Design a protein around this ligand. Structure first.
Ligand SMILES: [Mg+2]
Ligand SMILES: [Mg+2]
Ligand SMILES: [Mg+2]
Ligand SMILES: [Mg+2]
Ligand SMILES: [Mg+2]
Ligand SMILES: [Mg+2]
Ligand SMILES: [Mg+2]
Ligand SMILES: [Mg+2]
Ligand SMILES: [Mg+2]
Ligand SMILES: [Mg+2]
Ligand SMILES: [Mg+2]
Ligand SMILES: [Mg+2]
Ligand SMILES: [Mg+2]
Ligand SMILES: [Mg+2]
Ligand SMILES: [Mg+2]
Ligand SMILES: [Mg+2]
Ligand SMILES: [Mg+2]
Ligand SMILES: [Mg+2]
Ligand SMILES: [Mg+2]
Ligand SMILES: [Mg+2]
Lengths: 234, 150, 138
RNA sequence: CCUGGUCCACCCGUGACGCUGAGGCGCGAAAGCGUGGGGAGCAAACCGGAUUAGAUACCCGGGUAGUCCACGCCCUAAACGAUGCGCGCUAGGUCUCUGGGUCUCCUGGGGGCCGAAGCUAACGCGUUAAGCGCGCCGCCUGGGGAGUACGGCCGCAAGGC
RNA sequence: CGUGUAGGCGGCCUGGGGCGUCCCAUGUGAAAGACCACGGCUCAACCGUGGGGGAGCGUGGGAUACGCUCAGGCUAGACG
């Protein structure tokens, strides 16, 4: 059932903008495009899940990251749909590496979250209302998903690792295990658990985010139907 | 909490319209003497602060020193850029012979017997880094043949 | 035109591993064999087979490296960190058996040719001989 | 017209006949020297006009060697990639010159740029290495004194080594 | 910047020699000093005794992987 799925419209990407380290992961170059070998993506999607599973069922949280408009939303879903921390906006630096401090911004979201519903607003000149509002607005804008666990993610799942490599660095400098969906655009070596496949067309993104967040909850109970994806999906 | 000995402190400085500002730097080593040592460089607007920061990174960045009889497993040379270092193990009851830096490290490294020599740039800082990376690169009959399985 | 084919091989090896690579092919020779036949017997390589590239007989030599690693630069430790030739073509180095080096404090090997075969630091000391200290590996 | 080097393609011939290279020899920009031509433009020197405190300069008007040619010297240079030569090995991306192919592609030589790994004091280098190695030559060993002095060889001299 | 004399450096395989090279034996390597022990002077310095070594070099025997030499073959260098 997987083969026909991926191969359907979810394989082979980046062309000639490649990176030689991604060789063991290729069939050939069709019409110019690099066509990754799918037969190995299984053996790799496998081992990857082998790692997800043996974590979902040991109650440890996973940070999802994606900041590209071709794959932002389709993660905000699978994250809420797993109740897991995620990053949809600009993955600000040092979020992990400098946790204690970025966190201090979260404790500013709830500093306003509770001074939202309150009688203290009867006052505060129109100045601080526009201000404190805006401040909660953006605070929120960037930290919608970076609240969740106030603890260092036991691992991290990421779309284009070369995109949010900054992130990958942080995790890597902290020994935090790293899973991610990289293509030819991305250098394998520096990813602990590797998902070799498309990283742009919203097709392959949902197919691997889905069955990943699906295999997440299948170690907690609650097997459901697929998640919101089609709404204008081509 | 470990040993924490302070290698050196320095007042650096930069220019700017009006006058020259300052800053202080701190090489600090740290040890239990069971083969766990840590090096850290700390710069801050004040002497006290600097040293604090020193121990902090030190405790962050330490390494397993595979002792033996109180000395070291095998001999090593290491260049850190310009500054080179010789670590050569001595028989029981020699002494830790090195300069302030390589000793100050090697002491809380829990070593006692070890012949050593600085070479090239004898820049404290850069010798320091050398001394560590030297250690780091140590091996034992064990973890050696561990790589020569098959 | 290769001056000392060995220090070449020796380097080919050295160079292949810095990037971590399946194998590499020193052009063949009974002596390059013999030498390889000790890197492997001593656990520095997986070993080696004979091959061909247009009637040209090289030696496929399969390297050995460490386990992956956590933290940044997860690249494996090397089975062969260091390998530098001695007794060079522009200056042969020989040794009596008492003159034989004690590499890396036992942790290392000093391959070396002699009248009774290409022994090693221990193999020679034990066999009680010396000769052209070919190179040191570890 | 005479002639050098050089790349490719076919795998034909020779069978290691190789690499480097102290001395030696040859070449060696410009300026300069000798003999003889040549001389339009330009132009050290030199003459004037300005500027200027001065202006043996910068700007303007003139102008001789020289710049050209033949033959013979001179033998220097930021003679620069400030990177000796030969060979093996160590990601690719891109554009470019020029070869060969059952030519959207591949492969060989050359010239650039960005860059793995690695080197690096840094700057940077990076299959055109400053990487990793071997061979052989050359050269360095604080600044000034000084490329001076003496000696020696070379040169008509200037002067060179 | 070239060219090249001397010299330095020399691709794959087979064999002969065994110069380098390696091992064994024997001779030599005086003694004094040095070093390890033991003692002689009240200790020590000094000093006696004993032991252990020293590269070198001569001689005899052996080894033949690497270097050299001679002999045969090869074509990946080089040349045509
Ligand atoms: Mg250096
Ligand atoms: Mg023939
Ligand atoms: Mg030549
Ligand atoms: Mg000239
Ligand atoms: Mg001229
Ligand atoms: Mg003239
Ligand atoms: Mg004029
Ligand atoms: Mg005029
Ligand atoms: Mg130039
Ligand atoms: Mg010069
Ligand atoms: Mg030269
Ligand atoms: Mg090219
Ligand atoms: Mg570059
Ligand atoms: Mg290139
Ligand atoms: Mg001078
Ligand atoms: Mg001069
Ligand atoms: Mg003179
Ligand atoms: Mg010759
Ligand atoms: Mg002999
Ligand atoms: Mg004596």
């Amino acid at each position: 059932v997987k083969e026909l799925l991926e191969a359907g419209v979810h394989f082979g990407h980046e062309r000639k903008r490649w990176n030689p380290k991604f060789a063991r992961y290729i069939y050939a170059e069709r019409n110019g495009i690099h066509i990754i070998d799918l037969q190995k993506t299984m053996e790799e999607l496998e081992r990857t899940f082998r790692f997800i599973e043996d974590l979902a069922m040991r109650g440890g949280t996973i940070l999802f990251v994606g900041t590209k408009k071709q794959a932002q939303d389709i993660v905000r879903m699978e994250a809420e749909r797993a109740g897991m921390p995620y990053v949809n906006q600009r993955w600000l630096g040092g979020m992990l590496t400098n946790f204690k401090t970025i966190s201090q911004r979260v404790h500013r979201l709830e500093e306003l979250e509770a001074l939202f519903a309150s009688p203290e607003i009867e006052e505060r000149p129109k100045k601080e209302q526009v201000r404190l509002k805006h401040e909660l607005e953006r605070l929120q804008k960037y930290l919608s998903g970076f609240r969740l666990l106030k603890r260092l993610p036991d691992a991290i799942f990421v779309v284009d690792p070369t995109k949010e490599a900054i992130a990958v660095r942080e995790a890597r400098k902290l020994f935090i295990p790293v899973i991610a969906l990289a293509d030819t655009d991305s250098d394998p070596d520096l990813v602990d658990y590797i998902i070799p496949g498309n990283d742009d067309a919203i097709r392959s993104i949902q197919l691997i985010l889905s069955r990943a967040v699906d295999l997440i909850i299948q170690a907690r109970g609650g097997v459901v139907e697929p998640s919101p994806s089609y709404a204008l999906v081509q | 909490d470990f040993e924490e000995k302070m290698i050196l402190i320095r007042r650096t400085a930069r220019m700017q319209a009006g006058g020259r500002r300052f800053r202080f730097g701190a090489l600090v080593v740290v040890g239990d003497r069971q083969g766990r040592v840590g090096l850290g460089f700390g710069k801050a607007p004040e002497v006290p602060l600097a040293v604090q920061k020193a121990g902090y990174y030190a405790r962050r960045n330490m390494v397993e020193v595979p002792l033996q009889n109180g000395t070291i497993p095998h001999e090593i040379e290491v260049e850190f850029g310009a500054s080179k270092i010789v670590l050569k193990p001595a028989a029981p009851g020699t002494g830790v012979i090195a300069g302030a830096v390589p000793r100050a490290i090697l002491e809380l490294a829990g070593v006692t017997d070890i012949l050593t020599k600085e070479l090239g740039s004898r820049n404290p800082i850069n010798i320091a880094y050398a001394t560590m990376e030297a250690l780091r690169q140590l091996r034992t009959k064990a973890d050696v043949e561990r790589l020569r399985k098959g | 035109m290769l001056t000392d084919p060995i220090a070449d091989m020796l380097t080919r090896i050295r160079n292949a591993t810095r990037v971590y690579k399946e194998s590499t092919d020193v052009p063949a020779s009974r002596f390059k064999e013999e030498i390889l036949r000790i890197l492997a017997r001593e656990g520095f390589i997986k070993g080696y087979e004979r091959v061909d590239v247009d009637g040209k007989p090289y030696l496929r030599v399969y390297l050995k490296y460490g386990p992956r690693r956590q933290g940044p630069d997860p690249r494996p430790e090397q089975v062969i960190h260091h390998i530098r030739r001695i007794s060079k073509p522009g200056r042969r180095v020989y040794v009596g058996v008492k003159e034989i080096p004690r590499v890396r404090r036992g942790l290392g090997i000093a391959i070396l040719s002699t009248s009774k075969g290409v022994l090693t630091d221990r193999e020679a000391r034990k066999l009680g001989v010396g000769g052209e200290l070919i190179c040191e590996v570890w």
